[PDB]
Design a protein around this ligand. Structure first.
Ligand SMILES: [Fe+3]
Lengths: 325, 166, 325, 166
């Protein structure tokens, strides 16, 4: 599992740095992320690229396969990470033209962070919806390190508990997003008996989500064993096609989303799933998915975080769908 | 003039799966309000499952019997006002088998222990249900809720009744 | 079974401010971010910049030669007088499942509705014929229009730019300044000395100069004619907004700089090749593939077309590579 | 500061075809500057064909013979000063079969007719070669040029040895 990465030259015309990770090569210009590897090249619009990179960075390579698109992406092996071109593309694979390299995670993570920092310019936030931020086009112009560096937020037990991750307020840096301005903010009435003020806990979760400053970022709010409630606020398009190595459930809390559903292995379209407020559905472990959301909307992503699942799905000792009827 | 659409027992609008090449049963698609609307009060119908873990939908109406659990649970109010009472059990082992999972229906009778406190949930509010407490709900009006938990003696599975199949 | 002509203006949404449209069994709605299409039994979303850029080309090109794929799902096939509009016709996932849908229209009826769509959905300061760095954004609620940018005069030489009565050369005075990204291209006219009497047929002009002044992108445009052989150069920047599946060979001669062409199978949509072209490179795009170009810097491209109507009839039985090698 | 890259006989950077699943030969890929650097003076090499029609590349060097054609043609200068001479023929059926197509080489002797005009082309300049005219070129230094014409008596097809076969 490879470790070799490298900073190359700042280009004199564009002002950006190119980077290397194994056989892979990363170059940006005014419009494009340019990728090469042994035997191949590919291009991705710089805005779509940075948005995807932003997620893969923030999510620590996430669960399973993070497809930037139909060619390029990562597989997470939890401590090691596969970078690929065309691994989940019928055309490359049938032709034996896909290319894969495996890395220690903190070593790929490091060059990814360097790419994201160098390639991001003043006023461009790749964690936000396009209506909320500026543009990535043109030569290197300053940076946006504050935006690409927000601290991941994770509950040990539940938001708001003594010593656990806290509630979001104007005070502490999280005002309500313009597209959730009507969302009620009152906290639930909590009244503990003397001695119990630590165990008697409630919070306004929809108010919490309305105060999320990024889009498409599942973030832990409550924990029961490996069962994790990861709600987030969603706007525009999920900047990746997620092929999970486990089943995952979506509960639409507000407004609506359409999930474009494709085959995980081939990338052939399979179904389109429209979800409104209170709809709950399952994403099978043999699909990849990508959501589209016009108004900023509240989604609950529900995960089982157990390490056991992938090898069981491969072995067939757990199912591709959690129930049948 | 921003409107953030939320559902209610009375007013929701189910979506669904459009097929290209797939079986709609794979997405196990339902709507929590619908499921809560048809069930018996406090009946915990599972709407999501992943190995042993579950999400449960239920309608709160009147006063529930008592519950306790060998692990933590969480409850999310989704519509209308729900009151939660907490009692610290003197011997929780007497109501809950320790090696068990999922919530336990521990009876309508007041169990022995002391008063932990009280919670009042509206739409969008989440509460801790801590292991070792017994808990009880009161809703003056039909309200909906979800449980983050594990399948046990209280959880009702009826996938074919509730999910899209065409 | 005739070709259809049933199109319709639908309602004006009160919050979006946009009108929606029917053409046969297809419906067109746009909101803040998306173009939302329907047809009996299906639906699809395309982000609105991409859609409007693609729509611009289909209209300006009068439906072009052969297949104009807006994306992997939606497009038109030109039949020259009539036109098919499709969902999934060249997507093997849809075809295999009997889920592709096609509707044949009279071209005049289908064009009128596109222009209406294009007019209504284009807002002040958004020019869908330009590169992204040259113009504003299409996002958000209706806000004015830009009918001038979408009403541009098609320009076609009958014999050659600059001949008497023929399409004129471009200058600042007739409203065509040099593009910012061609600032250093020489602009002198060639020296022409006609003898008394022959000033009609002694003609020459500065073609690169002419291209340097093109005010639109990706718009093949006739500069010279010999029977069916057409010289159709244009200026190229960013990404060609569609994937072109031609019904005959088209030739590309790269005149300046650099383009990379993403080559896919025309039926299936599978990656087949990537063609890199620099100044002086000439290649054939065979009738069995579709292509999509990438140009970082604004570049000059000569598209050479054989405009003869006899060719689609013959390339169906006989020879997709037009060269005996 | 903006730099627009044009090729030349002396300075060109051929690109090419990267294969995923296909045959490079389908793309008939060559570079007009290389083709012309390797040809003899004024040899017209086909670099594009589409049925009858051609694009031809040539290196102009010194003074060519005279040409005429049964149909319009066009010449595009690709690199360097090329001089064009036009003569209206008294009797063009005397040199070019009409109903033939493609340029005809009509010898180096001055054809019978009237002086029509002179054109001096540089890189990026295009000129009409009108039907019923006789034309010739002078180039002080090697220069690259392209014809838009039809497959005829001067058209040279070196297909397999100008294009990218691997
Ligand atoms: Fe996912």
């Amino acid at each position: 599992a490879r470790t070799d990465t490298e900073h190359l030259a700042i280009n004199n015309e564009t002002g950006y740095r190119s980077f290397r990770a194994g056989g892979f090569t990363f170059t940006r210009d005014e419009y494009f992320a340019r990728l090469t590897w042994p035997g191949g090249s590919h291009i991705i619009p710089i805005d779509a690229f940075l948005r995807a990179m932003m997620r893969d960075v923030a999510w620590g390579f996430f669960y399973g396969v993070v497809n930037f698109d139909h060619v390029f992406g990562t597989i997470n092996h939890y401590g090691e990470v596969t970078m690929f071109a065309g691994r989940f593309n019928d055309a490359y694979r049938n032709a034996g033209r896909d290319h894969e390299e495996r890395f220690k995670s903190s070593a790929l993570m490091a060059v990814f962070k360097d790419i994201l920092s160098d390639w991001t310019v003043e006023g461009y936030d790749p964690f936000a919806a396009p209506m909320e931020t500026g543009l990535p086009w043109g030569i290197k112009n300053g940076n946006n390190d504050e935006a690409i560096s927000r601290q991941r937020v994770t509950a040990r037990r539940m938001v708001g508990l003594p010593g656990d991750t806290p509630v979001r307020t104007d005070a502490n840096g999280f005002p309500v997003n313009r597209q959730f301005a009507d969302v009620p903010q009152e906290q639930p009435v909590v009244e503990a008996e003397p001695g119990f003020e630590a165990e008697v806990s409630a919070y306004n979760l929809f108010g919490y989500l309305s105060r999320s400053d990024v889009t498409w970022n599942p973030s832990v709010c409550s924990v029961v064993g490996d069962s994790l409630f990861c709600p987030t606020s969603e706007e525009f398009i999920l900047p990746v096609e997620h092929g999970n190595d486990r089943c995952e459930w979506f509960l639409q809390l507000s407004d609506e989303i359409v999930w474009d559903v494709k085959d995980k292995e081939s990338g052939k379209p399979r179904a389109r799933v429209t979800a409104r407020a209170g709809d709950i559905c399952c994403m099978p472990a043999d699909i990849r998915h990508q959501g589209y959301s016009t108004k900023r909307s509240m989604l609950l992503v529900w995960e089982n975080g157990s390490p056991k699942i992938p090898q069981m799905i491969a072995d067939g000792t757990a199912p591709v769908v959690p129930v049948t009827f | 003039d921003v409107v953030t659409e939320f559902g209610a027992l009375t007013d929701y609008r189910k979506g669904g799966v459009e097929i290209i090449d797939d079986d709609p049963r794979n997405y196990v698609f339902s709507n929590v309000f619908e499921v809560a609307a048809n069930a018996a009060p406090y009946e915990r119908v599972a709407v999501g499952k992943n190995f042993e873990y579950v999400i449960e939908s239920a309608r709160a109406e009147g006063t529930s019997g008592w519950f306790s659990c060998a692990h933590d649970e969480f409850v999310l109010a989704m519509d209308g006002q729900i009151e939660v009472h907490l009692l610290k059990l003197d011997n929780s082992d007497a109501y809950v088998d320790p090696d068990s999972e999922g919530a336990v229906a521990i009876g309508e009778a007041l169990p022995e222990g002391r008063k932990m406190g009280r919670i009042v949930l509206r739409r969008g509010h989440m509460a801790l249900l801590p292991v070792g407490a017994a808990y009880r709900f009161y809703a003056e009006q039909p309200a909906a809720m979800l449980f983050q938990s594990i399948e046990g003696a209280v959880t009702v599975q009826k996938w074919g009744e509730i999910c899209q199949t065409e």
